[PDB]
Structure formats: structure tokens, C-alpha cells
Amino acid sequence: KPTTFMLKYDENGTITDAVDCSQNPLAELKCSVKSFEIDKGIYQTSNFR
Amino acid sequence: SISITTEVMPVSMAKTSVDCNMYICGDSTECANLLLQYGSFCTQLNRALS
Amino acid sequence: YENQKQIANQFNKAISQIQESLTTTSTALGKLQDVVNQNAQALNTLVKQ
Ligand SMILES: *[C@@H]1O[C@H](CO)[C@@H](O)[C@H](O)[C@H]1NC(C)=O
């Protein structure tokens, strides 16, 4: 199914890890700030309809 | 003599948010695709206001 | 002049506590970190454009 992924290329050029930006709110928050580790707080991510 | 005077100081203003895809486009779906070609202007605007 | 030893000891203990609270990774320098972060996000936006 057509989804958005944030793939992780390592030092040697291979894909080691990825997140699915449509699974949870937390995976969307990971994709929007472009990181795997998030600090504490409140963050705006997207808009709802 | 004893005198009591007043000083008025502003501290804050009204907080505001905007929806770009509703302000610029609305409910349309051709406008959304045409607006995707401009990069992140609306992520940038939402950060500034927030 | 009559309580000089107690005052000198309180000064030295407070200095050591400043040192021990800065060593223990508690983030009290978040303002200079915010300066760094804002400059880097500005340049990331300009290069991504
Ligand atoms: C890259 O490849 C070399 C040789 O195959 C290996 O020794 C090295 O550990 C690899 N680097 C990583 C980060 O896996």
C-alpha cells in the first residue's frame, strides 16, 4: 500500500533501519522532526480534517 | 504630601495559528499538489507563529 | 570577624556543590544550546530549499 517511510542509510551505504510514518502518532512525530530519539515535550505534527 | 500615580505596561498579546492548506487552497486537491512544488513554506510558517 | 571560619566553610561547600551539579549532566545551559539549534535549523531549511 502507498505509504511514506523514513529510511536510514549507514556509513557503508546500506539501509539499516526504517520507520513507517503511518503506524502511530509517535512514528509520525519521528518522521516530522527527522530523528529516532525524541525529547520530552509537546509538538505539533500535522492537521486533521 | 502623599501621591499615588499609575503606570500601564503591556505584557502579552493574542496567540494565533493559521492553516496554510485551508487559507491558500481550501478543500481543493489540485491546489494542494500545485502548492507542494514550493518546498516547506508552511512548516516554516507554522514554526514561526508557534 | 567573629564568625569567619563558618562563612569560609559555607563558601567552599557552595563552590563544590556548583561543581558537582554541573558535572552531573543536568542541563542548565539550555539557552546556549537553543542558540546553536536555531542557527542549524535555519541553515538546514536554506539548503533543503
Ligand atoms: C563496513 O564494511 C566493512 C567491511 O565490510 C566492515 O568492517 C565495517 O564494520 C562496516 N561498517 C559498518 C558501520 O557496519
Cβ distance A47 to B50 less than 8 Å, yes or no, reads no
Experimental method: cryo-EM
The three three-digit cell numbers of residue C43, written as one number: 541553515
Which chains touch A (3+ CB pairs under 8 A)? B
Taking Cα atoms as reference points, which of B11, B34, B7 lies closest to residue B21? B34
Q: For residue C25, what are the contacts with CB-CB under 8 A and spacing of at least 6?
A: none
Spell out which residues of chain B touch residue A44, defining contact as CB-CB under 8 Å: 46, 50
Q: Which of A9, A4, A39 is nearest to A19 (CA)?
A: A4
Closest CA to C45 of B38, B30, A42, B20: B38
Positive/negative CA dihedral, B25, B28, B34, B40: positive
Give chain A positions within 8 Å (CB) of B19: 47
Q: Are residues A47 and B19, on separate chains, in Cβ contact within 8 Å?
A: yes
CA dihedral sign, ordered C38, C39, C41, C45? positive
Cell (9 digits) for B4: 499615588
To one decimal place, what's the resolution in Å? 3.1
Task: Considering only CA atoms, give the Rg of chain C.
Answer: 21
